[PDB]
Amino acid sequence: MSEQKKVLTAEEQQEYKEAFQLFDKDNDNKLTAEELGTVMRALGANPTKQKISEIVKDYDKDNSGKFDQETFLTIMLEYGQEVDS
Ligand SMILES: [Ca+2]
Numbered sequence: 001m002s003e004q005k006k007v008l009t010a011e012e013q014q015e016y017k018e019a020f021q022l023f024d025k026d027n028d029n030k031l032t033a034e035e036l037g038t039v040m041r042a043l044g045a046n047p048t049k050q051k052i053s054e055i056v057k058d059y060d061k062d063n064s065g066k067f068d069q070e071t072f073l074t075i076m077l078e079y080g081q082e083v084d085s
């Protein structure tokens with residue numbers, strides 16, 4: 001295959017699986033605000049810990065201050081692609 005899709009495809013699933021897995025040696029199956037900020041930076045540019053921490057505490061208040069793969073997979077799946085570039 002000449003073309004490739006790193007979004008809403010198997011490539012995205014594996015990419016994120018290893019991304020969170022490698023950044024989760026504690027084996028918690030989740031990532032804290034700080035951890036999420038590191039992986040999120042790859043999707044955006046380079047935000048501040050205080051900024052990301054505020055979004056995590058506001059986006060994750062009905063659960064906790066951690067991130068679950070299911071949440072990221074659901075959001076990326078509902079968006080259809082999220083990023084265009
Ligand atoms: Ca962890």
Ligand SMILES: [Ca+2]
Binds near residue numbers: 061062064
């Ligand atoms: Ca949550």
